[PDB]
């Protein structure tokens, strides 16, 4: 039972860590979006980064 | 002689036209600078990683 209680507490800390992974309101790892697109040239063509949910 | 004297008015008119175009080119420098800045604004705003306040 002690090992099971430690396991569950570490599992909740994972949710805390993943939910706080934001930079000025945007995240590539908290699951809130499927991709982010950054500017690649002056015409506005994108540099996509696929989201990796954690 | 009267024909030669009337060329002074023609010269006055051509100089007036050059002055009008000079004022338009001075305004056009301002307008092209403003348009370049607006293009930079729209280019920055098209990024989706901005939060609402920056947009």
UniProtKB/Swiss-Prot annotation, chain A:
Domain of life: Bacteria
Location of this chain's protein in the cell: Secreted; Bacterial flagellum
Subunit organization: In C.crescentus, the flagellar filament is composed of multiple flagellins of 29 kDa; 27 kDa and 25 kDa.
Task performed by this protein: Flagellin is the subunit protein which polymerizes to form the filaments of bacterial flagella.
Family: Belongs to the bacterial flagellin family.
Protein name: Flagellin FljN
Source organism of the structure: Caulobacter vibrioides (strain ATCC 19089 / CIP 103742 / CB 15)
Lineage: Bacteria, Pseudomonadati, Pseudomonadota, Alphaproteobacteria, Caulobacterales
Covered residues, full protein: 111 to 164 of 273
UniProtKB/Swiss-Prot annotation, chain B:
Family: Belongs to the bacterial flagellin family.
Gene Ontology molecular-function annotations: structural molecule activity
Main location: secreted
Secreted in keyword set: yes
Localization per Swiss-Prot or TrEMBL: Secreted; Bacterial flagellum
Function: Flagellin is the subunit protein which polymerizes to form the filaments of bacterial flagella.
Quaternary structure annotation from Swiss-Prot or TrEMBL: In C.crescentus, the flagellar filament is composed of multiple flagellins of 29 kDa; 27 kDa and 25 kDa.
Location of this fragment in the whole protein: 56 to 110 of 273
Name by which UniProt lists this protein: Flagellin FljN
GO cellular component: bacterial-type flagellum; extracellular region
Keywords: Bacterial flagellum, Secreted
Coiled-coil portions: none
